[PDB]
Amino acid sequence: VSKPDLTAALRDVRQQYESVAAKNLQEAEEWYKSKFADLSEAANRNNDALRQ
Amino acid sequence: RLQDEIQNMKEEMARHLREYQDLLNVKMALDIEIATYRKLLEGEESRISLPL
Amino acid sequence: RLQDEIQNMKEEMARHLREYQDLLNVKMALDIEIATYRKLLEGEESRISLPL
Amino acid sequence: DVDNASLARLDLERKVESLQEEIAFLKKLHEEEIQELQAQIQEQHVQIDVD
Amino acid sequence: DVDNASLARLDLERKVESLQEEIAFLKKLHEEEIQELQAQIQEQHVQIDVD
Amino acid sequence: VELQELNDRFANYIDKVRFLEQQNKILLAELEQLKGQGKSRLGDLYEEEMRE
Amino acid sequence: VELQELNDRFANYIDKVRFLEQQNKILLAELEQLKGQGKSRLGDLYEEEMRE
């Protein structure tokens, strides 16, 4: 009980960096998909007003 | 741009394999703490189990 | 429009191909736990002392 | 007959419109799922404290 | 031009079908993000990294 | 005293079992959702749309 | 022999720690397969009607 755990504090910082590294990559992929949808359908709108 | 987002996604996934390598350094530290917790459990129940 | 719909499905798939590779890296850390459980059996045979 | 062929073509129009948003959701909610799961797999692990 | 349009609808449907595996993926990868955000909220509370 | 300290050491490793039994309920919930309840119902709904 | 049986019982609960770690790693190796293929294996029945 006089071990208010340092290995828990070092376990937190590792599992937090493992989670942050995964989520910072997944945010960048999900913004790439979402930006690709915006740019593609803005390009479709310009194509389609140019067809009307 | 959508073909370049298929490529940027493969390299963002190659970066998430490095974010997970740096999380895996912390996970392998917890796995060494589990391999050490085994030796602490082995040592403490041996203090409880006792001579003639 | 059909060419863009074909690229959008590939970017989504290309991310999911490493979302499962990082779950195989999590499974590889569970094989370090399986490899550590053999040292727990060697440790339990040691832990008992079989008294003295 | 031209209205019935327009009802057929209308499902795939409204679908391929909607499915541009479903890709733009897919990328995020997949890369969010895999990153919270690969944070779980790190929180799986160890503390000790010391003598 | 109902046929010329319908052959173009089938190339859009080929995207929709493939992308509707990917709806079923997406709509439950979000239930799974709510499980793994309940994992990262759970897993400081237990455990901590596991003591 | 070593019997009670090694009793309470096995009680600490039971609390370590409860913690990994909680992790085992997270990865179980994460197994079922997409496979079980995703494409079964979301397929069935679209299968009747594309049948129509 | 009670402190030794409770040392070996803490080794049994370290092997239950490793067992719930190994069960959560099996559920990880099954959920990565069931995310990657569990959409498509339930789609391909319905979506191959729709492709025909």
Tab-separated table of all heavy atoms in Angstrom, chain A residues 3 5-8 11 15 18-19 22-23 25-27 29-30 33-34 37, chain D residues 20 23-24 27-28 31-32 34-36 38-39 42-43 46-50, unseen atoms left out:
chain	number	residue	atom	x	y	z
A	3	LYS	N	3.073	1.859	-1.923
A	3	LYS	CA	3.515	1.773	-3.310
A	3	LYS	C	2.476	2.439	-4.234
A	3	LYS	O	1.965	1.773	-5.128
A	5	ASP	N	1.023	3.638	-7.090
A	5	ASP	CA	1.955	2.927	-7.977
A	5	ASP	C	2.637	3.795	-9.057
A	5	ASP	O	2.014	4.400	-9.936
A	6	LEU	N	3.975	3.761	-9.048
A	6	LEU	CA	4.811	4.320	-10.110
A	6	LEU	C	4.733	3.498	-11.399
A	6	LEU	O	4.816	4.072	-12.486
A	7	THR	N	4.579	2.174	-11.315
A	7	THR	CA	4.456	1.328	-12.508
A	7	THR	C	3.109	1.507	-13.199
A	7	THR	O	3.105	1.585	-14.419
A	8	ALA	N	2.048	1.857	-12.463
A	8	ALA	CA	0.791	2.360	-13.006
A	8	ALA	C	0.973	3.706	-13.723
A	8	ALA	O	0.659	3.793	-14.900
A	11	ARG	N	2.701	2.891	-16.885
A	11	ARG	CA	1.776	2.063	-17.679
A	11	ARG	C	0.737	2.935	-18.388
A	11	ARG	O	0.665	2.848	-19.608
A	15	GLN	N	0.322	3.290	-22.499
A	15	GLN	CA	-0.992	2.977	-23.073
A	15	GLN	C	-1.695	4.224	-23.642
A	15	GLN	O	-2.386	4.150	-24.660
A	18	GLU	N	0.337	4.787	-26.960
A	18	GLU	CA	-0.180	3.774	-27.897
A	18	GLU	C	-1.556	4.179	-28.460
A	18	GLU	O	-1.748	4.215	-29.679
A	19	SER	N	-2.443	4.681	-27.592
A	19	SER	CA	-3.765	5.199	-27.968
A	19	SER	C	-3.687	6.489	-28.793
A	19	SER	O	-4.350	6.600	-29.823
A	22	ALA	N	-2.292	5.720	-32.388
A	22	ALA	CA	-3.378	5.155	-33.185
A	22	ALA	C	-4.420	6.215	-33.592
A	22	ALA	O	-4.724	6.344	-34.779
A	23	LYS	N	-4.891	7.044	-32.650
A	23	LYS	CA	-5.959	8.024	-32.906
A	23	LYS	C	-5.528	9.221	-33.751
A	23	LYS	O	-6.200	9.507	-34.733
A	25	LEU	N	-3.297	8.960	-36.139
A	25	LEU	CA	-3.273	8.382	-37.491
A	25	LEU	C	-4.688	8.173	-38.064
A	25	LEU	O	-4.924	8.485	-39.229
A	26	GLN	N	-5.635	7.705	-37.245
A	26	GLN	CA	-7.022	7.450	-37.658
A	26	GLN	C	-7.811	8.739	-37.951
A	26	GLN	O	-8.426	8.824	-39.011
A	27	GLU	N	-7.584	9.814	-37.189
A	27	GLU	CA	-8.098	11.165	-37.472
A	27	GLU	C	-7.624	11.684	-38.842
A	27	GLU	O	-8.427	12.157	-39.650
A	29	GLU	N	-6.545	9.832	-41.472
A	29	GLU	CA	-7.200	9.000	-42.491
A	29	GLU	C	-8.680	9.384	-42.684
A	29	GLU	O	-9.142	9.532	-43.819
A	30	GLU	N	-9.407	9.650	-41.599
A	30	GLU	CA	-10.833	9.976	-41.655
A	30	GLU	C	-11.099	11.386	-42.209
A	30	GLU	O	-11.957	11.555	-43.085
A	33	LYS	N	-10.577	10.856	-46.098
A	33	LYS	CA	-11.841	10.375	-46.702
A	33	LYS	C	-12.866	11.501	-46.850
A	33	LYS	O	-13.437	11.698	-47.920
A	34	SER	N	-13.028	12.285	-45.792
A	34	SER	CA	-14.045	13.334	-45.687
A	34	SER	C	-13.771	14.525	-46.608
A	34	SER	O	-14.621	14.920	-47.404
A	37	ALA	N	-14.503	13.356	-50.153
A	37	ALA	CA	-15.938	13.463	-50.433
A	37	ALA	C	-16.369	14.899	-50.793
A	37	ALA	O	-16.900	15.105	-51.884
D	20	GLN	N	-21.556	8.931	-50.830
D	20	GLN	CA	-20.429	9.865	-50.680
D	20	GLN	C	-20.259	10.336	-49.227
D	20	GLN	O	-19.131	10.372	-48.726
D	23	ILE	N	-18.860	7.111	-47.211
D	23	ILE	CA	-17.380	7.033	-47.284
D	23	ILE	C	-16.722	8.046	-46.331
D	23	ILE	O	-15.744	7.730	-45.644
D	24	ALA	N	-17.207	9.291	-46.332
D	24	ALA	CA	-16.658	10.367	-45.507
D	24	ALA	C	-16.858	10.128	-43.996
D	24	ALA	O	-16.046	10.592	-43.186
D	27	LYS	N	-14.131	6.476	-43.191
D	27	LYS	CA	-12.711	6.712	-42.920
D	27	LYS	C	-12.480	7.062	-41.451
D	27	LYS	O	-11.568	6.520	-40.843
D	28	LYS	N	-13.321	7.945	-40.911
D	28	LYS	CA	-13.209	8.481	-39.553
D	28	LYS	C	-13.525	7.433	-38.506
D	28	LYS	O	-12.595	6.895	-37.929
D	31	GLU	N	-10.928	4.683	-38.407
D	31	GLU	CA	-9.632	5.119	-37.872
D	31	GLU	C	-9.722	5.569	-36.410
D	31	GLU	O	-8.724	5.479	-35.708
D	32	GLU	N	-10.907	5.962	-35.948
D	32	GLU	CA	-11.274	6.215	-34.552
D	32	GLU	C	-11.425	4.886	-33.777
D	32	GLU	O	-10.614	4.637	-32.888
D	34	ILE	N	-10.121	1.749	-34.672
D	34	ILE	CA	-8.811	1.075	-34.610
D	34	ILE	C	-7.859	1.766	-33.614
D	34	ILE	O	-6.978	1.104	-33.068
D	35	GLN	N	-7.967	3.083	-33.405
D	35	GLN	CA	-7.082	3.806	-32.480
D	35	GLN	C	-7.506	3.680	-31.013
D	35	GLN	O	-6.635	3.420	-30.187
D	36	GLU	N	-8.806	3.684	-30.703
D	36	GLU	CA	-9.294	3.409	-29.341
D	36	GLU	C	-9.077	1.929	-28.947
D	36	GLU	O	-8.427	1.671	-27.936
D	38	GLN	N	-6.518	0.062	-30.234
D	38	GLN	CA	-5.063	-0.029	-30.037
D	38	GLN	C	-4.546	0.834	-28.864
D	38	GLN	O	-3.373	0.715	-28.504
D	39	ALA	N	-5.415	1.601	-28.194
D	39	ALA	CA	-5.193	2.160	-26.858
D	39	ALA	C	-5.610	1.179	-25.743
D	39	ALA	O	-4.771	0.867	-24.889
D	42	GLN	N	-2.947	-1.423	-25.185
D	42	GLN	CA	-1.860	-0.883	-24.358
D	42	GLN	C	-2.243	-0.767	-22.871
D	42	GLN	O	-1.472	-1.229	-22.030
D	43	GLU	N	-3.474	-0.353	-22.543
D	43	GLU	CA	-4.013	-0.348	-21.165
D	43	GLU	C	-4.220	-1.766	-20.586
D	43	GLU	O	-4.312	-1.947	-19.375
D	46	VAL	N	0.626	-3.455	-17.360
D	46	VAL	CA	1.250	-3.537	-15.998
D	46	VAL	C	1.665	-2.253	-15.215
D	46	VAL	O	2.659	-1.615	-15.549
D	47	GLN	N	1.314	-2.273	-13.912
D	47	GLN	CA	2.052	-1.640	-12.786
D	47	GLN	C	2.628	-2.620	-11.743
D	47	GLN	O	2.152	-3.750	-11.619
D	48	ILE	N	3.585	-2.157	-10.916
D	48	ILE	CA	4.209	-2.956	-9.830
D	48	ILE	C	4.386	-2.185	-8.494
D	48	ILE	O	3.863	-2.646	-7.489
D	49	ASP	N	4.990	-0.984	-8.486
D	49	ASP	CA	5.680	-0.378	-7.306
D	49	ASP	C	6.915	-1.204	-6.856
D	49	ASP	O	7.268	-2.199	-7.486
D	50	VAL	N	7.723	-0.670	-5.933
D	50	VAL	CA	9.098	-1.117	-5.655
D	50	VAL	C	9.439	-1.058	-4.162
D	50	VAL	O	9.112	-0.101	-3.458
